[PDB]
Design a protein around this nucleic acid. Structure first.
Ligand SMILES: O=c1ccn([C@@H]2O[C@H](COP(=O)(O)NP(=O)(O)OP(=O)(O)O)[C@@H](O)[C@H]2O)c(=O)[nH]1
Ligand SMILES: [Mg+2]
Ligand SMILES: [Mg+2]
Ligand SMILES: [Mg+2]
Length: 1826
RNA sequence: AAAGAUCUGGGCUGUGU
RNA sequence: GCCCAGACC
RNA sequence: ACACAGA
RNA sequence: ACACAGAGACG
């Protein structure tokens, strides 16, 4: 590389330009490393570098062989010196000899390079190296090198004339280069290679003599020393290990590391597997006897048809063989009553007698209404006047009844025995009627599965033809009016035309039939959730009415884990409309009434019904966007929209696991359509996963449609369409409906099953399947151990593997690791591992996760049957270990291993994961096994960190390998390359891994001193005792005989009862014993290491095979591999050069990507049928779908989770949670308008959770909210429709403060907080007070504090932990040293609000849903007394809090002043900049465009963190107070940074006690928390779109809607853009601009209070015409342009040469945007600086400040000099940034004509002083003007 | 009830009388 | 760092 | 000591 | 009505 070319290829502008940091990955093929011969003879270090081994990439050609000497005192800098030798042969250059002499302390600072071009451009280049392995280390080094030199260079820039400085940085690591230089890829690769040799030299020189390196920290040495002592003195008693655990002989390990791999066996096995794979490929894809593709596709169709017919027949043979029944998919009636006025009364008169003679349900309803209309049911008529009196009660606890709720709306009907029988058939008091014959027969029939040939055609007709999307004409009813009022009040913040259009679209969606139905269904679900706690005696029912609808419900509650029964009733006159379709359950005709049979719902099933309206609204909006229909368009629905919305409806309502599982499998069924020749699609491979019981009509319908999809795929693959430079696919369709659609629509339809609720509760009879999943794998254990680590076999069975192939895979991975990290990688790995193990603390293991309490005392069921098993928290065990005195993980793991070995097993307990896509069992260890597992997983993570393609330990490799395959193939093969990929998954990954293989793989890469620990610690995995549920085992114990078609159920019964002997269960035991398999994710990283080894072997083998060729000549190819845990992908790129060679090369590559299935069992890995093999131009990895240059992300996945019912306790934290959910929908691929509609649904959800459909006082509450829109009191804030979900909740809170009456309330809160002293009541620090603190002032608690208090009483922590921390503050800044500091840190952890709220709350979603009946009127909210004031009691209702705010906080006059706005919202200036950028899109105007299909992830940075400190204030305070070298600065820079900290906070001192007694903080923990957050935030949103002050504008324009662009004078703009960018000179350009302003006509200007380019053009149109008169008056009235002049000119002086300087105290006075501005400036002969800013008003401070920045930009005045004025102002300006008025490092801000063309700049200006020109108007042409 | 991990974002019968 | 949420294994 | 180097 | 190739719940 060359420094001159690299520095001369930079485009530099005036002033200092940092640029943008670019990242370079190690992509290109690398030659072998040269030979190194390092000697240390104490006369320096002599390295004998040999020649680079022969290759052809021109990489490594900068390394010259021969002797090199590097002195001992210069040998600690080798990595820096050798890497950059050739880029910069020199060493350093001071700033004194290139820059003007400043008199700071920085004149002696030496950046690596200071280059100077011929014109005068200066490039300051800094070099850096890091030995880290992640991007974080590169970012840290880049940031510290920028921080060290940015400020002094800028100070020198101030005093230069015509300066152009860049200041680039290059940071080099092993696998990355981070630099803002325009480096080529080859230069970065060369730097990485040179760094590899340099680090090899450095490691060798350190190994030979230990004084080359530098003295490292005491803590690092102690960590390394304790780790070394542990691993040297650890004796696991391997003889006892062998006698205790199966196959634990260490002679296996000794043989594995010393016996080389059997080369002949490997070659013979590889040939045999090759011919077996070829035979399988030829037989199963019909390649011989050489037919055409049509005939082979027909044979594929016939095979698929036959196999699906076998499936259907086998499923029918075990069913009840009924071809017709009446069983509704939807258990709710299709009623659409017109909504009525708010009422929850049960007023009923007259007709009861006709109801009596209409069956059992008519009898029940008539008796209920008769009892209601006689006064014997309490609370039938609500009183929203006494409830208000309770709500406004100044004295709770005395005027709220306690015992009224006992008889609330409860009636006890005297039903006949026939009616009780009928109701018991539905489960209503069904346990008592269990032995009656009808109940027995119904129970017997309930277990029978359904036939696949069942008539299900009402479902298909409903899906194609329904009235779900018809307008209901209910748009002016009460629920609509309430939601509309709340939405319009929220939208008054951004009351524009876009807001109105999107609100109208939302309200049209809200007025559809399905949403109106979902609204009352959600209200019914909320009433049932309320009835959960409303206990009923025997025979007692509850009668309720829905608030907005004439619907009555009779409810029978049970135990809260058991069922809720309900019956519905309406008047037939009240049924205005109905939902069409035959998917609904039949109702009952009862004369005047329509009734509903008793249906059941559990707690988990309620959620989907609660969220149903938001689900349906979001589905309608999403599928309208995906069909290309704009939100602002009225259009009748097509068949596809009806099908999608109806399918979502049915999936949400059925809420069953098999239903969503069938839909989930369609993804793997339909991915076979991308399989390329010479292979055919085989979607019939999924037929094994569709075998299972069918229990609903929808399951039958979905299975049949899935099988039709499978037959369709098997006969016709998706077609390739390459047209211009992209690859498109044709023939895609929805799997369920069958209708043709886009690729993205098919991918999204693969996730419709996600609408089923994950959080179901599993029943006891469903719990045995888990045990079944564990047993047959253990039953497949080989009876002989010869192929479990000892020998070699070519035909391994289950759990078996061959030693030679495992060793060869380890060798291959070791070769790749030695290529990347050098030949001394293991030496550095040892130091890394010892550091990690010795540093790690016991409190680091004190997590919030559960642990197993299973032990020897729980093993025998006869001693346990009366007990209840409970898991513990790991925090308890770790706290017990800390109290006893253990402080390091080293001192605990020895005792943990001793306890495990004495136990002889590992103790596990089980549970079932709540997941989509099927069944997964989950294992929980006890604390001893966790302590042992932690060390081996640490070592495995450290090894996986070194792998060049393992993605679990290297997150960037999730993407970089896939998207760098194109560059690598383009370099190696040229253009026009064919890419063939395979995406592979493994079958039962954790269950198939015998842990001896994992131990051998891990011990291959670790140094021998760890081997004794690794072999023993994994050995305990070969005897695992797994506790089963005690209730399941209790029901099993009472049934010694088995009546089941499942063999496992009988086997388990006999094993527990002793009737048979099996290896996994003994008689009368509570556990299953298992030897095979790791557990789920327990040995995650070592299994990733094994898979990395295997795929490294595959890559090497594929490369060798491609080099061999098919008939002798090599195939040119590029092979890439990527690995997860069991997930893998292989990418092979070829260029065949002709048509005839292309067929042969593709056949060869298909054969290579067909034998992975056959080579995997040699490593104990089994290919899953979820693997998609041999697909051209497309690859999938961890559900990331790369379809050539189209990255497809399933947006429906995140849209389905956008309205989670939050468990949070603060009211505004609900809106923060909603915003966090919204951002993920935005990043998942949704447009901005879709995100806004999703937020409208979130608003509806939020007000439902506040009691919109429940509380009779919600109207009063809403009326109070209109006059007080406080988010802390429940007001939902809506986003700007053009940028929805992109800014966050704090930005919207700042907008609400700046716009609504929340500013007055926050100003009052600020004044009340500022007025108190430290000893005062309700005092809090104003410095630690932000807008988020004020919004978090109202809370409601959901958990039980008694559980948390009992947990505290079992831990023994000191009560005066705050005082003991105050005695020793240093405990809050570094690790503990003794028992005392660790106990203090533990007590600090457990008393944190997050830990307390986590250990208090369990599952509280039903309580949150049922709180809607009492949040408004009952005193359950705790409020901050520092903010809301002392109340009469500690708790209040929401209406009470609104009145308290209405009498105190709303009386305060005046909004926030700029100082308060700056303190509460530190990022307010960036907020205002973005908000100004957002107000140019206020109208729905634009054009429909082409979507262009090129889609990629791209990050958008906004609200960027300003430049204040070099380091974090945490580290600076730590270093100054306690001597910890947490920063990277010398004493001069450390003192300089401490000066800026003290400038920010004058009370800060070098003594912690002085700061504690002089600051605003009562305790020192509070100061630690405050100093943790001095730097506020930095927000970046990762959009998914076109391959990109400017970028925000583009994404706002191009992402409002897919295929839409949101936009005489514009013709003038189009002319001027080509004029100012054209190849002309100033003379020729000046003519036709005047000509264009003399031809075209421009509207006359007006008064605007924002920046408009149009009226700026109008002003120059009038200037060139001189119509009105003086141009200055026109500009003054139009209020666009800086006007004014110097009221005190500076003394003008001649600089040495040709420059002109100023020295006096000049004063500028003028107007900038309707504001009188007086600027005071000074000078010293080198620069000029601001002294004071005087403004007559602060209404538009931010715009005025930006105008001052532009005014000082061209006048050469800098805001870098601090003023000595210590008086009072409103704000201070430092670097043209607004600061709080208490700051002491900026200037105070206090209250009180010719036209030119610069470079592509068009300005109107006037002279101000001699040798000084200032602008008035500027217009910059933009690329969007054409 | 909620294991081992990776990313990204954020935070620091209270019952309807 | 700690806690929370979502997605992924 | 200043100025360098930085898992 | 929920669960389930009849292992449970319906107090
Ligand atoms: O929630 C999870 C998901 C995945 N994993 C770990 O990731 C492995 C692969 O995750 P997987 O989703 O492929 N399931 P797998 O066990 O392979 O069976 P199959 O359905 O046939 O593919 C699993 O074997 C676990 O070890 C977890 O530990 N926890
Ligand atoms: Mg340097
Ligand atoms: Mg798998
Ligand atoms: Mg997987």
């Amino acid at each position: 590389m060359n420094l001159e070319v690299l520095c001369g290829r930079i485009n530099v502008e005036n002033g200092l330009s940092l640029g943008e940091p670019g990242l370079y990955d190690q992509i290109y093929d690398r030659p072998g490393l040269p030979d190194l011969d390092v000697t240390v003879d104490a006369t320096g270090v002599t390295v004998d570098i040999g020649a680079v081994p022969d290759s052809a990439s021109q990489l490594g050609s900068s390394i010259n062989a021969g002797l090199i000497t590097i002195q001992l005192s210069e040998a600690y800098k080798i990595n820096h010196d050798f890497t950059f030798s050739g880029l910069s042969k020199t060493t350093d250059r001071r700033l004194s000899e290139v820059f003007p002499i400043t008199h700071d302390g920085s004149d002696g600072m030496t950046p690596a390079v200071i280059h100077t071009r011929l014109d005068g451009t200066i490039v300051v280049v800094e070099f850096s190296t890091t030995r880290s392995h992640n991007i974080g280390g590169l970012e840290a080094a880049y940031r510290t090198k920028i921080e060290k030199y940015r400020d002094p260079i800028s100070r020198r820039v101030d005093i230069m004339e015509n300066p152009r400085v860049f200041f680039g940085v290059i940071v080099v690591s092993s696998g990355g280069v981070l630099s803002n230089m325009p480096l080529t890829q080859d230069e970065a690769e060369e730097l990485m290679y040179r760094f590899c040799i340099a680090n090899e030299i450095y490691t060798k020189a350190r190994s030979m003599d230990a004084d080359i390196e530098l003295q490292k920290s005491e803590e690092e040495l102690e960590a390394i020393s304790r780790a070394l002592s542990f691993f040297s003195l650890f004796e696991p008693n391997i003889e006892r290990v062998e006698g205790t655990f199966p196959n634990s002989e260490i002679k296996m390990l000794e043989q594995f590391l010393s016996t080389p791999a059997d080369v002949d066996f490997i070659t013979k096995t590889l040939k045999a597997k090759e011919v077996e794979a070829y035979a399988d490929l030829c037989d199963s894809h019909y390649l011989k006897p050489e037919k055409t593709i049509q005939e082979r596709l027909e044979i594929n169709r016939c095979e698929a048809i036959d196999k699906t017919q076998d499936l259907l027949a086998g499923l029918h043979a075990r069913s009840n063989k009924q071809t017709s029944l009446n069983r509704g998919t939807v258990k709710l009636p299709p009623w659409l009553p017109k909504p009525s006025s708010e009422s929850i009364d049960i007023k009923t008169d007259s007709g009861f007698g006709s109801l009596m003679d209409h069956g059992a349900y008519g009898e029940l309803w008539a008796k209920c209404l008769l009892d209601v209309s006689l006064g014997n049911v309490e609370g039938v008529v609500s009183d929203p006047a006494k409830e208000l009196d309770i709500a406004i009660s100044d004295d709770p606890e005395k005027d709220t009844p306690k015992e009224a709720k006992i008889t609330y709306r409860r009636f006890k009907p005297a039903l006949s025995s026939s009616a009780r029988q009928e109701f018991s058939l539905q489960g209503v008091e069904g346990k008592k009627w269990k032995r009656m014959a009808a109940n027995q027969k119904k129970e017997k029939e309930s277990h029978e599965t359904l036939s696949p040939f069942l008539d299900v055609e009402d479902i298909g007709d409903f899906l194609t033809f329904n009235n779900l999307l018809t307008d209901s004409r209910y748009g002016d009813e009460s629920i609509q009016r309430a939601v509309s009022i709340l939405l319009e009040k929220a939208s008054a913040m951004q009351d524009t035309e876009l807001t109105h259009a999107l609100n109208d679209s939302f309200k049209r969606n809200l007025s559809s039939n399905v949403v109106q139905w979902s609204l009352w269904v959600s209200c019914l679900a909320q009433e049932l959730a309320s009835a959960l706690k409303q206990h009923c005696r025997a025979g007692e029912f509850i009668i309720k009415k829905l608030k907005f609808w004439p619907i009555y419900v009779i409810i029978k509650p049970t135990k809260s884990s058991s069922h809720i029964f309900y019956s519905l009733g309406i008047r037939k006159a009240d049924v205005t409309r109905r939902l069409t379709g035959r998917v609904f359950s039949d109702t009952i005709d009862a004369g005047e009434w329509e009734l509903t049979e008793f249906k059941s719902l559990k707690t988990c099933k309620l959620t989907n019904l609660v969220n149903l309206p938001c689900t349906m609204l979001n589905s309608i909006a999403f599928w309208r966007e995906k069909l290309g229909v704009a939100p602002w368009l009225v259009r009748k629905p097509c068949s596809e929209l009806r099908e999608q919305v109806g399918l979502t409806f049915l999936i949400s309502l059925e809420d069953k696991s098999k239903t969503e599982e069938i839909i989930t499998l369609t993804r793997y069924t339909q991915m076979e359509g991308f399989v390329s020749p010479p292979m055919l699609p085989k979607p019939q491979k999924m037929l094994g996963k569709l075998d299972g019981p069918l229990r609903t009509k929808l399951q039958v319908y979905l299975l049949r449609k899935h099988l039709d999809c499978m037959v369709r795929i098997a006969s016709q693959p998706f077609s390739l369409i390459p047209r211009e430079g992209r690859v498109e696919w044709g023939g895609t369709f929805h799997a369920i409906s069958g209708r043709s659609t886009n690729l993205e629509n098919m991918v999204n339809s693969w996730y419709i099953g996600y609408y089923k609720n994950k959080e179901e509760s599993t029943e006891l009879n469903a719990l045995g399947e888990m045990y079944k999943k564990i047993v047959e794998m253990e039953e497949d254990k080989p009876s002989s151990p010869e192929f479990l680590g000892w020998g070699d076999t070519d035909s391994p069975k289950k759990h078996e593997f061959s030693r030679s192939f495992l060793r060869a895979a380890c060798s291959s991975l070791e070769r790749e690791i030695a290529q990347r990290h050098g030949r001394q990688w293991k030496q550095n790995l040892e130091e890394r591992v010892l550091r990690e193990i010795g540093t790690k603390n016991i409190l680091d293991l004190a997590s919030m996760k559960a642990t197993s309490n299973f032990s020897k005392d729980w093993e025998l069921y006869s001693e346990v049957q009366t007990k209840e098993y409970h898991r513990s928290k790991l925090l308890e065990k770790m706290a017990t270990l800390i109290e006893k005195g253990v402080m390091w993980y080293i001192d605990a793991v020895g005792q943990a291993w001793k306890a495990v070995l004495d136990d002889g097993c590992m103790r596990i307990c089980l549970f079932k994961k709540n997941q989509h896509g099927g069944l997964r069992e989950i294992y929980v260890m006890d604390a001893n096994a966790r302590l042992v597992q932690f060390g081996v997983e640490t070592m495995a993570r450290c090894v996986c960190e070194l792998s060049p393609h393992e993605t679990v330990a290297n997150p960037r490799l999730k993407n970089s390998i896939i998207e760098n395959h194109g560059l690598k193939s383009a370099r190696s093969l040229g253009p026009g390359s064919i890419n063939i990929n395979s995406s592979n998954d493994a079958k039962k990954w954790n269950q198939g891994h015998y842990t001896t293989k994992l131990a051998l793989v891990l011990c291959w890469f670790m140094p021998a001193k760890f081997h004794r620990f690794i072999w023993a610690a994994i050995s305990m995995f070969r005897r695992k005792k797994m506790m089963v549920d005690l209730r399941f085992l209790a029901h099993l114990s009472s049934k010694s005989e088995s009546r089941s078609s499942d063999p496992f159920r009988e086997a388990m019964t006999d094993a527990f009862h002793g009737n048979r002997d099996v290896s996994w269960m003994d008689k009368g035991r509570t556990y299953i014993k298992t030897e095979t398999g790791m557990m789920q994710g327990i040995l995650h990283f070592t299994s990733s290491l094994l898979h990395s080894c295997v795929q490294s072997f595959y890559k090497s083998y594929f490369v060798s095979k491609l080099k061999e060729g098919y008939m002798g000549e090599s195939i040119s190819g590029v092979v890439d591999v990527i690995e997860g845990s069991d997930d893998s992908a292989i990418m092979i790129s070829i260029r065949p050069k002709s048509d005839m060679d292309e067929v042969r090369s593709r056949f060869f590559v298909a054969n290579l990507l067909h034998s992975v299935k056959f080579l995997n069992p040699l490593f104990g890995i089994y290919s899953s049928e979820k693997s998609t093999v041999n697909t051209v131009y497309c690859v999938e990895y961890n559900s990331e779908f790369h379809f050539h240059r189209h990255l497809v992300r399933p947006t429906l996945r995140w849209i389905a989770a956008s309205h989670q019912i939050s468990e949070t306790e603060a009211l505004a934290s609900r809106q923060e949670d909603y915003s966090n959910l919204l951002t993920q929908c935005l990043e998942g691929g949704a447009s901005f308008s879709l995100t806004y509609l999703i937020q409208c649904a979130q608003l509806l959800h939020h007000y439902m959770l506040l009691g919109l459909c429940l509380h009779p006082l919600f109207g009063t509450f809403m009326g109070m909210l209109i006059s007080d829109p406080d988010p802390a009191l429940g007001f939902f804030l809506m986003d700007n429709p053009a940028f929805a979900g992109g800014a966050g909740f704090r930005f919207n809170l700042w907008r609400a403060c700046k716009t609504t009456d929340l500013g007055r309330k926050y100003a009052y809160y600020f004044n009340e907080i500022q007025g108190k002293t430290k000893g005062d009541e309700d005092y809090r620090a104003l410095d630690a007070t932000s807008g988020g603190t004020l919004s978090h002032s109202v809370m409601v608690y959901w958990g039980d504090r008694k559980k948390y208090q009992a947990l505290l009483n079992r831990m023994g922590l000191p009560e005066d932990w705050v005082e003991q921390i105050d005695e020793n503050p240093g405990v809050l800044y570094r690790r503990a040293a003794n028992k005392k500091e660790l106990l203090l840190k533990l007590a600090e952890k457990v008393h944190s609000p997050g830990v307390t709220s986590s250990l208090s709350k369990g599952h509280v979603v039903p309580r949150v849903v049922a709180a809607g009946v009492y949040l408004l009127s009952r005193h359950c909210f705790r409020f901050s007394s520092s903010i809301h004031g002392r109340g009469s009691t500690q708790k209040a209702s929401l209406i009470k809090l609104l009145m308290m705010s209405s009498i105190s906080a709303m009386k305060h006059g005046g909004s926030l002043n700029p100082n308060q706005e700056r303190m509460l919202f530190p990022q307010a200036q960036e907020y205002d900049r973005v908000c100004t950028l957002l107000e140019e899109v206020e109208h729905l105007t634009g054009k429909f465009v082409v979507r262009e299909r090129n889609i990629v992830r791209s990050r958008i940075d906004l609200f960027q963190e300003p430049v204040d400190l070099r380091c974090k204030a945490e580290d600076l305070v730590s270093e100054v107070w306690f001597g910890l070298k947490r920063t990277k600065l010398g004493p001069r820079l450390l003192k300089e940074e401490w000066d800026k900290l003290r400038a920010s906070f004058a009370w800060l001192s070098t003594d912690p006690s002085e700061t504690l007694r002089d600051g605003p903080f009562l305790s020192h923990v509070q100061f630690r928390n405050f100093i943790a957050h001095v730097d506020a935030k930095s927000r970046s949103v990762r959009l998914l779109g076109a391959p990109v002050v400017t970028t925000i504008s583009q994404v706002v324009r191009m992402n409002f809607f897919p295929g839409f662009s949101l936009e005489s004078i514009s013709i003038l703009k189009h002319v001027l853009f080509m004029v100012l960018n054209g190849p002309y000179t100033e003379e020729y350009k000046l003519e036709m601009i005047i000509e264009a302003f003399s031809t075209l006509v421009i509207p006359q200007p007006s008064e605007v209070i924002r920046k408009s380019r149009t009226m700026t053009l109008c002003l120059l149109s009038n200037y060139l015409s001189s119509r009105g008169g003086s141009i200055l008056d026109q500009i003054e009235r139009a209020q666009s342009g800086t006007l004014g002049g110097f009221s005190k000119p500076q003394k003008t002086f001649v600089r040495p040469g040709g420059g002109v300087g100023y020295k006096g105290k000049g004063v500028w006075t003028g107007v900038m945007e309707d504001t009188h501005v007086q600027i005071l400036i000074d000078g010293d002969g080198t620069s000029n600086w601001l002294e004071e800013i005087r403004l007559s008003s602060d209404a538009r401070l931010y715009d005025v400040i930006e105008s001052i920045r532009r005014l000082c930009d061209d006048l050469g005045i800098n805001n870098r000099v601090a003023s000595a004025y210590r008086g009072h102002c409103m704000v201070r300006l430092s670097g043209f940034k607004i600061k709080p008025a208490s700051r002491t490092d900026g200037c105070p801000v206090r209250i009180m004509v010719k036209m030119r063309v610069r470079g592509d700049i068009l300005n109107l200006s006037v002279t101000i002083q001699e040798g000084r020109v200032m602008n008035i108007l500027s217009y910059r042409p933009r690329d969007t003007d054409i």
